[PDB]
Amino acid sequence: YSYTEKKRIRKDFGKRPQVLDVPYLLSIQLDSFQKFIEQDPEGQYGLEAAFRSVFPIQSYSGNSELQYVSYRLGEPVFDVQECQIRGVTYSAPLRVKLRLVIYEREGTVKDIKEQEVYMGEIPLMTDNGTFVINGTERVIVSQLHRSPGVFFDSDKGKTHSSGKVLYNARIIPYRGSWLDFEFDPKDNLFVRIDRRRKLPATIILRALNYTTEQILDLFFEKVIFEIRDNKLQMELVPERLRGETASFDIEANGKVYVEKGRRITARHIRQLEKDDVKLIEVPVEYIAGKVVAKDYIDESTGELICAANMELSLDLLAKLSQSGHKRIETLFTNDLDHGPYISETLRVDPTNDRLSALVEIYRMMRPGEPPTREAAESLFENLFFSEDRYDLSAVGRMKFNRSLLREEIEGSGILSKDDIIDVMKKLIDIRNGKGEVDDIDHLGNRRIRSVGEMAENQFRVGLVRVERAVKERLSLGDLDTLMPQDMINAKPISAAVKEFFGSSQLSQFMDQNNPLSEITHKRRISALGPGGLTRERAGFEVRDVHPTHYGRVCPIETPEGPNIGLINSLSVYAQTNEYGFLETPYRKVTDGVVTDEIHYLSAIEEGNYVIAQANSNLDEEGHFVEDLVTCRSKGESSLFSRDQVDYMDVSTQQVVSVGASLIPFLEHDDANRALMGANMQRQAVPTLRADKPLVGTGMERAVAVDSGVTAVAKRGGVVQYVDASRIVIKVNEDEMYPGEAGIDIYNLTKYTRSNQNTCINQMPCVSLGEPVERGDVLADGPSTDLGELALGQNMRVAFMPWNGYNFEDSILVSERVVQEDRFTTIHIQELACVSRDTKLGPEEITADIPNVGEAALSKLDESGIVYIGAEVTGGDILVGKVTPKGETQLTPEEKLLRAIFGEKASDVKDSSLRVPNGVSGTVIDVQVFTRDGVEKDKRALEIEEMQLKQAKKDLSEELQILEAGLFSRIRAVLVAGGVEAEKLDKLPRDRWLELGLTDEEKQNQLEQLAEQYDELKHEFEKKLEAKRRKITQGDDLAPGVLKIVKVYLAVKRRIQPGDKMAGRHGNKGVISKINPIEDMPYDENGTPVDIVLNPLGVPSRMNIGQILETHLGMAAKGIGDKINAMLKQQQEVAKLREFIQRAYDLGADVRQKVDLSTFSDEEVMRLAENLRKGMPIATPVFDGAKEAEIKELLKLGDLPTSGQIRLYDGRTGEQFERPVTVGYMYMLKLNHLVDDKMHARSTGSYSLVTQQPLGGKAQFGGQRFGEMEVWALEAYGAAYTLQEMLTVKSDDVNGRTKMYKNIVDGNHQMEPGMPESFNVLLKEIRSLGINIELEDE
Amino acid sequence: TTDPVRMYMR
Amino acid sequence: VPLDGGRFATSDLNDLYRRVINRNNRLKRLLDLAAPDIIVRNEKRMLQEAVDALLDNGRRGRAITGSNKRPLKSLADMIKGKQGRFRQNLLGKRVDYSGRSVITVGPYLRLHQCGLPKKMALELFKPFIYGKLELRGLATTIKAAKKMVEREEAVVWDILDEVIREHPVLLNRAPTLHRLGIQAFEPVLIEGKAIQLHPLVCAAYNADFDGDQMAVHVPLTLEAQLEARALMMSTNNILSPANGEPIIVPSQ
Amino acid sequence: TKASLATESFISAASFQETTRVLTEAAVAGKRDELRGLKENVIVGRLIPAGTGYAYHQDRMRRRAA
Amino acid sequence: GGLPRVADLFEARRPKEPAILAEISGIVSFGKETKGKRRLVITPVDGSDPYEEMIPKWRQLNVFEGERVERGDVISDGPEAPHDILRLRGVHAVTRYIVNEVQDVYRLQGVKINDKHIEVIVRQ
Amino acid sequence: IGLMKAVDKFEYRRGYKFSTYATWWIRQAITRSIADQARTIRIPVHMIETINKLNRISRQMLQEMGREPTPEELAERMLMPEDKIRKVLKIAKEPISMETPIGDDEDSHLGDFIEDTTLELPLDSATTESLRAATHDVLAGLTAREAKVLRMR
Amino acid sequence: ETPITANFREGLNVLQYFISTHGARKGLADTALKTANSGYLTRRLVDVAQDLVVTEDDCGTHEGIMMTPVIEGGDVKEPLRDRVLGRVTAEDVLKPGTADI
Ligand SMILES: [Mg+2]
């Protein structure tokens, strides 16, 4: 076992030793972006592939091209933290060298210029796989879209309501025009450019310079029909007659083979093999129904006897025979095997020449515009033949060639004559029966364009849009007078990149309220967005589960809203291939043993082999134990032999996602409820006491270390200094760099506002001076318990009704829970004030607010900015601001007051950033950003000074740590070879450098150290100065805002009735009311019960995972009972090991690795010290424990076998008859707190356009009363209710005021007027050419 | 075509 | 109208109107500038295009807006459709004196009463509270009553209990299929923030306690208070109108 | 859906049906709506002629047009 | 069946495979050969006899040739069109039809609604 | 329009081709026209020219400073003084269509969150109707002379 | 042709859960996407209904639809009593003997 385990172990279960380690789940993101920047010396994806594509941009025949040299990504302008502080995006500059060349006219002169010009910046992904578009950590969801290449669909059934089911093909490139090849119900072949009109497919061939003779000689087989001397013969092949009908008599070689009426059977076929028949004569009727390919003119008159693709008549027969023609070509027609398709189309086709084909296509594309040779030629060759306007993308070229049964997968990005003729051959082959039609939903036809590729594509758009000005200025400009920079601009290039990152249906905010949420989010693969489909654009089938999803996308994890089947999650071990498809790992089963090698089978790669099933007895020497094992080979699942085994599953938990994997006993929950629980799992909000899951799946570390929320150790060493701020780790001598020696000085984050207004914070987990290897969590963060994912809490559940307090799905929680603050989640709101210039002068942030009290301004400073730490509640002032407002002209009644009591009116209004009503917290951070020029106030200077001094403090701290950790090395060398010890430490450490050694390579070491040292001391300088210059630097504010004062509140909402809670199994509910401890039903020992669920909530929605999670948790806590007893009784170190050993055991056929070799006493001591609160237990997704194993775990923990006990009522005292299933469970506190849902309004603001109650301001807005509500009111006799609804409470500028002035007079009487929305409707109708009016009183 | 820009362009 | 940061927020109707005016002016300038026919006949068509796109945008060529690529909304577009006027304005509007919250159990409640959170009732009946306070000699004027309830003085809780007394309220479940989707109950002041609902009515409402939310509505006229007692009150709606079978039957 | 098309009140039709069409047609004909119904009333904000509104409409319509 | 079914029932949509009806009593008779579709004549008893129709031969028949068949008879198989049920039968027959059919889809699962309601829709 | 203007004031005698001359009036009658019909809030031509020049200077300096020039830098590169830059850029904003969909991509638009800060809330209208009566009673408590004098001043 | 052979208590294995996942998805989507369907139906119904109110005391027609029990195939589905309860007679209904009331 490692070092992070010796502090607390998790007992595993089941069998099937894990062969493949946990893959870094944040790979797909990091790797996709690790392909977009990593410079590539060829056309492979990346910025290089973009420049190489759009470049060189040569002028219009001026030969004054502009090549692409190379690119460089200079260091960013701001670091991640400062970037968030200021709000700007986190991107690196992108400078690109360009080379403008010209060839002036003897001649051959070559010129050139070179310089690297800046063209926009590109956003940089973080180590966690996220970007910062604007002060918000954002995730770029990977997209799943149709793969390029060829596609053969069916379009069967509905077609012309005949059942004659048609066929069609579709060449879908990666960037360009599509090519459709469909069949017409009369067996015709038609082509479609992109979606345009329909044209007889033959036309395209005539555009490729294919004469009619050749078109005929490209599909049908020529059958010789000669009339040598007489008696029309045939160079027939014995195979051609297979499955045909006879119409004549055969007398070949005197032998009479076939007669008229007896068709050619399978017998006659081989009968022609013994006699070796190659020539047979036919009457003047069998040829009367054939075609002729090559033209036949008379050798005397020049006239045309018969043309190409022309029928044959006995009359024209004599024409060609009298002219002297002997060799006649025919097309091997077959209404069953080889249809006449192409020929039947050539008749429907108007144009018979090349130029006319180009024309027809041109007028098809741009109608009404008279075509010309040049325009039509250019249009045609610029569709599927120009790299400038058409590219297949090696992915597309690969799938295209492979689908066409080719050999070399690597080819050009453009199509060729063969690329078209081959696809047509394949389509016709399917039209004959051989071949198949690809599945539109097969995972082998769905690429995954992740962030790194979409970034490149959107960047390429910004390059192509500037390609215009380059050709322009390079053709209609001048010579050397200009440089390769004067014709470029950063805004157009970086536009299409910015646009992508700032707003896109694929780029969103990181789902940061749960580490599991961050991990499972970046693993989502949406089918919507750019290039995808709309929710109402995709049918109800493309959302279903396909057998290829196995090991690639968890068939469970998905949203249950309108985006069902279009979102899904990437599987645990699933990985992306080199191209774009999804491949899952496997284990090769050689000879009948299962090796340890891995082979990632792609979607189509798997569809040909027969992999074994993850659940099968592989335990032994290693050979397949069972004889007939269940496997999947041809998409279908069935029993296969023991010798036909190709591969095997890596593990049972590879068909699920990271979220569905954490579900314990998932083999016991139905799919519906599993889906529900999986989705709700990523809603659990972190608590105050991050508590480990008593029953997990082991997969916690696989998510707590992946999410950057943790803090792992890079280099191994011993902790030099622990603190709640930083952790200095003294690196090990054998694990450090041979220069300056460094140390690992970590800096934890403290109480940052998450994207969901929650709290994120990291807390240490190791004390001073403790051995720490690499891979050990140096500190825990939100929802992290010493390395495990702490999603929820451990609640002692007991299934029993309780006076209907739980009635439907409501949850009944004890008072003890809400007392120990185990669900008291902390929140951090961020409310800022903005003093900006107005029409009557700039606003003021002074504490001199009019019409206020002295009790409020007592919590502000000399600048009216709330004191840090000072606790406040809703309605209190945090930033005193006043906006100027002149020219009031109050009513005379008020002027009389101003004259009576002498109360002059201020010329200023009030702005006053005041705490939102409903929440009360503590101020934990106050920031001030002042516009450049405008001198800072007092509090602004105080905050700038605190920034400065805190900066120097932290900087000098880091510096001293490194300086001492380096002077120690100086001493190490200054002694070895030059021993000085006493005298050495006598003089100051400054003289340590002036001293030297005798001739030896050790003198080099010194010279190295003194270098690094001084270099470090120089490094520090630029870091300080820089951070100083930014602090005093004029902050970047919006155009027209004086100052901005940010305030960060810290709410600590508790758990009260109305909050939602769910189990990680698909069982939701709402806390009805917190019931006291006394009334809480207890049991024998006297211990109360945390939560009391409803038993009736299991037997409907299968969701049996809670049932067994409770029993296993009861046992896992019963073992902790004994651990805690022996810890409290301080018996000895003997019983501890005696019990713990036998514990990590029992079961059947497990893998846990007995202890007692662990530092015996001292280490089994800390194990028990942290094992008091039950013993953690793992439960793999399908390799979890079973009933009998739990039954034994219970008997070990001095617990019953049935998992049920008796419960005593707290109030009455008698015991509830009929045993009650009790125990523990993992409860999730979803981010659905009622304190944020509840809202109410009586008289708020109103929309300007239509005088209706503003449905915004997020709780202060009025409720919506839709049509259905009006119908419900119409059902009853209620008429004044409906009226006052849509008259007084919404519209009627007078109705609201009159009703309000009446309600206070004790008079409940409405005065209905005219809904303002209706007058606005009258305006909008009358402003048209429509006159609407009203008539009599 | 329909759009009145075509009436002018031709 | 202007907005935050200085940016001005305008309507697309403006852009379209401005276009019509520009092109009409240009045409008149040509008609008095002695221009040929190839120019003036192009101007007339541009004018027709702009006018038609102003009345109904999407029947000729879908004239787009400025910096934004999205097509601007024309006059007729501000009337039809499920969104906008006549459907989202005149038949269904938002209303004052209302609210919403997560609903829970409440067995102790009678089939006619429902538990309403205290703070919700305060904010809701604010206009009643102010007047009833200034009447009983506890608040000098309306403004003073506002500060009295804003301070949460003890007396105002009893005042609220006096105003709630027999003052029915309306509860609504988010999808309103039948008429029973809106039913009137008698307020029962309660602590916390959750709305208590009577289990016997959960069937009619077709709601669970898994996080579902319901909306509250406070009647104003004496009529709307009577109709919520003799027409909409819970204990007056027992057997459904669709079928004579009672809609109030014991659950799990 | 075809019967909900034709209705004495044009406003109630243009409320849910194809407004742009309904109004054009009922405009060339100079059609005149007296509302006589539910949706029209809730549009202009009036006591619906049904139930509690039917009694008020009773007392009003009685002396109205008479 | 289901909700898309009751949608059609209310929309009075014409069925895919309609079934011709009789307009008067009397012996039915054939007529002109197969031209495009086919013919069929109506032979009333006492009153005027101008009624006839064209029924395609590609659509099998069910009515008896030399047999009296009153108006609204099953001249063929397949579903029925409500428009044709109003003309040859009357105002009560069609409502009795729509209610009986729409009630079946609801009768399948646990739904009960008095015929009165559906009658109001039929009347509208 | 500028084409016609360049035609009427052209002499074929000078020899210079017509394509050179007509272009001046055409391109100017397009540029100035843009300056007059572009912004919903019309701006005098001069300001358009000056703003476009400021933009040009900020453009041709992106490659020099590395990212972008300083606020008080163009003050010298331009003929104009320093402090006028901030105002010229402050007024350079464009109106956002009220139909611009708000976040969440829902049908919710900007024109739905727009409040109305014109109508005074009813909580103050009640105070007005109360002060009216209070002042009336109080003034009716004084003498007659003082009463009319107060209701007059 | 490959039924499930394991129960929910014992626990499902990897292979068997896939077909359950399709069944679950069909149910989930078919019920979720059906919301707008039923809503649209009832919406058009209310738009065809609204103006219809109970005003006149008594029309004055003896017409009446002819109510008969559904009895079909094997057994009755809904007796005559239900489809006649609470309604109104059109013509005097008598005993099985004629000329009665
Ligand atoms: Mg629910």
Coordinates of C-alpha atoms in Angstrom, one line a residue, chain A residues 319-621:
Chain A
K319 CA -28.4 -1.8 -92.2
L320 CA -25.2 -2.6 -90.2
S321 CA -24.8 -6.0 -91.8
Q322 CA -25.1 -4.7 -95.3
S323 CA -22.6 -1.9 -94.6
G324 CA -20.1 -4.6 -93.7
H325 CA -20.2 -4.5 -89.9
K326 CA -19.3 -7.8 -88.2
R327 CA -18.3 -7.0 -84.6
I328 CA -21.3 -5.6 -82.7
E329 CA -21.0 -4.5 -79.1
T330 CA -23.8 -5.1 -76.6
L331 CA -24.5 -4.3 -72.9
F332 CA -25.0 -7.2 -70.6
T333 CA -28.5 -6.3 -69.5
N334 CA -30.2 -8.1 -66.6
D335 CA -33.5 -7.1 -65.0
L336 CA -32.5 -9.1 -61.9
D337 CA -28.7 -8.9 -61.5
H338 CA -27.3 -6.1 -63.6
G339 CA -30.0 -3.6 -64.3
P340 CA -29.9 -1.2 -67.3
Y341 CA -29.8 1.7 -64.8
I342 CA -27.2 4.0 -66.4
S343 CA -28.6 3.4 -69.9
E344 CA -32.2 4.1 -68.7
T345 CA -30.9 7.4 -67.3
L346 CA -28.9 8.5 -70.4
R347 CA -32.3 8.7 -72.2
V348 CA -33.8 11.0 -69.6
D349 CA -30.7 13.3 -69.8
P350 CA -31.0 16.3 -72.2
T351 CA -27.3 17.2 -72.7
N352 CA -25.1 14.9 -74.6
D353 CA -21.8 16.9 -74.7
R354 CA -19.3 18.2 -72.1
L355 CA -19.8 21.9 -72.5
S356 CA -23.6 21.4 -72.3
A357 CA -23.2 19.3 -69.1
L358 CA -21.1 22.2 -67.6
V359 CA -23.8 24.6 -68.7
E360 CA -26.8 22.6 -67.3
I361 CA -24.9 22.3 -64.0
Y362 CA -24.2 26.1 -64.0
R363 CA -27.8 27.1 -64.8
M364 CA -28.8 24.6 -62.1
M365 CA -26.6 26.4 -59.5
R366 CA -26.9 30.1 -60.5
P367 CA -30.1 30.3 -62.6
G368 CA -31.1 33.3 -64.6
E369 CA -27.4 34.1 -65.1
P370 CA -26.4 33.1 -68.7
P371 CA -23.5 30.6 -68.4
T372 CA -20.3 30.8 -70.4
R373 CA -17.4 28.3 -71.0
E374 CA -15.2 30.1 -68.5
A375 CA -17.9 30.7 -65.8
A376 CA -19.3 27.1 -66.0
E377 CA -15.8 25.5 -66.1
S378 CA -14.7 27.5 -63.1
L379 CA -17.9 26.8 -61.2
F380 CA -17.6 23.0 -61.8
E381 CA -13.9 22.6 -61.0
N382 CA -14.3 24.7 -57.9
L383 CA -16.8 22.4 -56.1
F384 CA -15.1 19.0 -55.4
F385 CA -11.7 19.6 -57.1
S386 CA -10.2 22.6 -55.4
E387 CA -8.4 22.4 -52.1
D388 CA -9.4 26.1 -51.7
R389 CA -13.1 25.3 -51.5
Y390 CA -13.3 21.6 -50.7
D391 CA -11.4 19.3 -48.3
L392 CA -12.1 15.8 -47.0
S393 CA -9.9 15.8 -43.9
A394 CA -7.8 12.6 -43.5
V395 CA -10.7 11.4 -41.3
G396 CA -13.0 11.9 -44.2
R397 CA -10.5 10.5 -46.7
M398 CA -10.0 7.4 -44.5
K399 CA -13.7 6.7 -44.0
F400 CA -14.3 7.3 -47.7
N401 CA -11.6 4.9 -48.9
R402 CA -12.4 2.2 -46.3
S403 CA -16.2 2.3 -47.0
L404 CA -15.3 2.0 -50.7
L405 CA -13.2 -1.1 -50.0
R406 CA -10.0 0.5 -51.0
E407 CA -6.4 -0.1 -49.8
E408 CA -4.5 3.2 -49.1
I409 CA -6.4 5.1 -46.5
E410 CA -4.3 8.1 -47.0
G411 CA -5.1 10.2 -50.0
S412 CA -5.8 13.8 -51.2
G413 CA -8.5 16.1 -49.8
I414 CA -10.2 16.5 -53.1
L415 CA -12.2 14.0 -55.2
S416 CA -11.2 12.5 -58.5
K417 CA -13.1 10.9 -61.4
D418 CA -12.5 7.5 -59.7
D419 CA -13.8 8.9 -56.4
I420 CA -17.2 9.5 -58.2
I421 CA -17.4 6.5 -60.5
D422 CA -16.5 4.2 -57.6
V423 CA -19.2 5.6 -55.3
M424 CA -21.7 5.2 -58.2
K425 CA -20.6 1.6 -58.7
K426 CA -21.1 0.9 -55.0
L427 CA -24.6 2.5 -55.0
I428 CA -25.6 0.4 -58.0
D429 CA -24.1 -2.7 -56.3
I430 CA -26.4 -2.1 -53.3
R431 CA -29.2 -1.6 -55.8
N432 CA -28.4 -5.2 -56.9
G433 CA -28.4 -6.7 -53.4
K434 CA -24.7 -7.2 -52.7
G435 CA -23.4 -4.6 -50.2
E436 CA -25.3 -2.9 -47.4
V437 CA -26.5 0.5 -46.1
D438 CA -24.5 2.0 -43.2
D439 CA -26.4 2.7 -40.0
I440 CA -27.0 6.5 -39.6
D441 CA -26.6 6.1 -35.9
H442 CA -23.7 3.7 -35.8
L443 CA -21.0 5.1 -33.5
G444 CA -18.6 4.5 -36.4
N445 CA -20.1 7.4 -38.3
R446 CA -19.9 10.0 -35.5
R447 CA -16.8 12.0 -35.0
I448 CA -15.9 13.9 -31.8
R449 CA -14.7 17.5 -32.6
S450 CA -13.3 18.7 -29.3
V451 CA -12.0 22.1 -28.2
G452 CA -8.6 21.8 -29.8
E453 CA -10.2 21.2 -33.3
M454 CA -13.0 23.7 -33.1
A455 CA -10.5 26.4 -32.0
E456 CA -8.6 25.7 -35.2
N457 CA -11.7 25.8 -37.4
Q458 CA -12.9 29.1 -36.0
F459 CA -9.4 30.5 -36.4
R460 CA -9.3 29.3 -40.1
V461 CA -12.5 31.3 -40.7
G462 CA -10.8 34.4 -39.4
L463 CA -7.9 33.7 -41.8
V464 CA -10.0 33.1 -44.9
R465 CA -12.0 36.3 -44.2
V466 CA -8.7 38.3 -44.4
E467 CA -7.6 36.4 -47.5
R468 CA -9.6 39.0 -49.4
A469 CA -7.5 42.1 -48.6
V470 CA -4.3 40.1 -49.1
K471 CA -5.1 39.3 -52.8
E472 CA -6.5 42.9 -53.1
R473 CA -3.4 44.8 -51.9
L474 CA -1.0 42.3 -53.5
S475 CA -2.5 42.7 -57.0
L476 CA -3.6 46.3 -57.1
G477 CA -0.7 47.7 -55.0
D478 CA 3.0 48.3 -55.5
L479 CA 6.5 46.9 -54.9
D480 CA 8.7 46.8 -51.8
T481 CA 7.1 50.0 -50.6
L482 CA 4.9 47.9 -48.3
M483 CA 5.7 45.1 -45.8
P484 CA 4.0 41.8 -45.1
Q485 CA 2.3 43.5 -42.1
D486 CA 0.6 46.5 -43.7
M487 CA -2.1 44.1 -45.1
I488 CA -3.2 42.3 -42.0
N489 CA -5.5 43.0 -39.0
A490 CA -5.9 41.3 -35.6
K491 CA -9.6 42.0 -35.2
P492 CA -10.9 40.1 -38.2
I493 CA -8.6 37.1 -37.6
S494 CA -9.2 36.8 -33.9
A495 CA -13.0 37.6 -34.3
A496 CA -14.2 34.1 -35.3
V497 CA -12.1 32.7 -32.4
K498 CA -13.4 35.2 -29.9
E499 CA -17.0 34.6 -31.1
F500 CA -16.5 30.9 -30.5
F501 CA -15.1 31.2 -27.0
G502 CA -17.3 34.1 -25.8
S503 CA -20.7 32.8 -26.9
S504 CA -21.5 29.4 -28.3
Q505 CA -24.0 26.6 -27.7
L506 CA -20.8 24.5 -27.0
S507 CA -18.9 26.8 -24.7
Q508 CA -20.4 27.4 -21.3
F509 CA -19.5 28.1 -17.7
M510 CA -17.8 25.3 -15.7
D511 CA -20.4 23.4 -13.7
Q512 CA -18.6 24.3 -10.5
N513 CA -20.5 23.3 -7.4
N514 CA -19.2 19.7 -7.2
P515 CA -15.9 18.1 -8.2
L516 CA -17.8 15.3 -9.8
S517 CA -19.7 17.9 -11.7
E518 CA -16.5 19.5 -13.1
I519 CA -15.2 16.0 -14.1
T520 CA -18.4 14.7 -15.6
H521 CA -19.1 18.0 -17.4
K522 CA -15.8 18.1 -19.4
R523 CA -16.6 14.5 -20.4
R524 CA -20.0 15.4 -21.9
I525 CA -20.5 15.1 -25.7
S526 CA -23.4 17.2 -27.0
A527 CA -24.8 16.6 -30.5
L528 CA -26.2 20.2 -30.7
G529 CA -24.5 23.5 -31.4
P530 CA -22.6 24.5 -34.5
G531 CA -22.7 21.8 -37.1
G532 CA -25.1 19.7 -34.9
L533 CA -28.9 19.6 -34.9
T534 CA -31.8 21.3 -33.2
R535 CA -33.9 19.6 -30.5
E536 CA -36.8 19.6 -32.9
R537 CA -34.5 18.9 -35.9
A538 CA -33.4 15.4 -34.7
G539 CA -35.9 12.6 -34.7
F540 CA -37.0 10.5 -31.7
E541 CA -34.5 7.7 -32.8
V542 CA -31.1 9.4 -33.0
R543 CA -31.5 9.9 -29.3
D544 CA -32.0 6.1 -28.5
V545 CA -29.3 3.7 -27.3
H546 CA -27.2 1.9 -29.9
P547 CA -25.2 -1.3 -29.1
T548 CA -22.1 0.6 -30.1
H549 CA -22.4 2.9 -27.1
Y550 CA -20.9 0.0 -25.1
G551 CA -17.7 1.2 -23.3
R552 CA -17.9 4.5 -25.1
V553 CA -20.9 6.5 -23.7
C554 CA -22.8 5.5 -20.6
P555 CA -26.3 4.6 -21.7
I556 CA -27.6 5.9 -18.4
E557 CA -26.0 9.3 -17.8
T558 CA -27.9 12.0 -19.7
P559 CA -30.4 14.8 -19.0
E560 CA -34.0 13.9 -18.7
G561 CA -35.2 17.2 -20.3
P562 CA -35.7 17.9 -24.0
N563 CA -32.0 17.0 -24.6
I564 CA -32.6 13.3 -24.1
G565 CA -30.0 11.2 -26.0
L566 CA -28.2 14.2 -27.4
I567 CA -25.8 15.0 -24.4
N568 CA -24.3 11.7 -23.3
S569 CA -21.3 11.1 -21.0
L570 CA -17.9 9.7 -22.0
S571 CA -17.3 6.3 -20.4
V572 CA -14.8 5.6 -17.7
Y573 CA -12.0 4.1 -19.9
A574 CA -13.4 5.3 -23.2
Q575 CA -10.8 7.2 -25.3
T576 CA -10.6 9.0 -28.6
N577 CA -8.6 7.4 -31.4
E578 CA -6.1 9.3 -33.6
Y579 CA -8.8 10.4 -36.0
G580 CA -12.2 11.2 -34.5
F581 CA -14.0 8.1 -33.4
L582 CA -14.5 6.5 -30.0
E583 CA -12.4 3.4 -29.1
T584 CA -12.6 1.5 -25.8
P585 CA -9.8 -0.7 -24.3
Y586 CA -9.9 -4.5 -24.3
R587 CA -7.8 -7.6 -23.4
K588 CA -6.6 -10.0 -26.1
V589 CA -7.6 -13.6 -25.4
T590 CA -4.7 -15.5 -26.9
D591 CA -5.3 -19.3 -27.3
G592 CA -7.7 -19.3 -24.4
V593 CA -5.8 -17.4 -21.9
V594 CA -6.4 -13.7 -21.2
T595 CA -3.2 -11.7 -21.4
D596 CA -2.5 -8.3 -19.8
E597 CA -2.0 -6.4 -23.1
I598 CA -4.6 -3.8 -24.1
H599 CA -6.1 -3.1 -27.6
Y600 CA -8.3 -0.1 -28.0
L601 CA -11.0 -1.2 -30.4
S602 CA -12.7 1.5 -32.3
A603 CA -16.5 1.6 -33.1
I604 CA -16.1 -0.4 -36.4
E605 CA -13.0 -2.3 -35.1
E606 CA -15.2 -3.9 -32.4
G607 CA -18.0 -4.7 -34.8
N608 CA -16.1 -7.6 -36.4
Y609 CA -14.5 -9.4 -33.4
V610 CA -16.1 -11.3 -30.6
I611 CA -15.1 -9.8 -27.2
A612 CA -15.9 -11.6 -24.0
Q613 CA -18.2 -10.2 -21.2
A614 CA -16.9 -8.2 -18.3
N615 CA -18.7 -10.6 -15.9
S616 CA -17.2 -14.0 -16.3
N617 CA -15.0 -16.4 -14.3
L618 CA -11.5 -15.6 -15.5
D619 CA -9.9 -16.4 -12.1
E620 CA -7.3 -19.1 -12.3
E621 CA -4.0 -19.8 -14.0

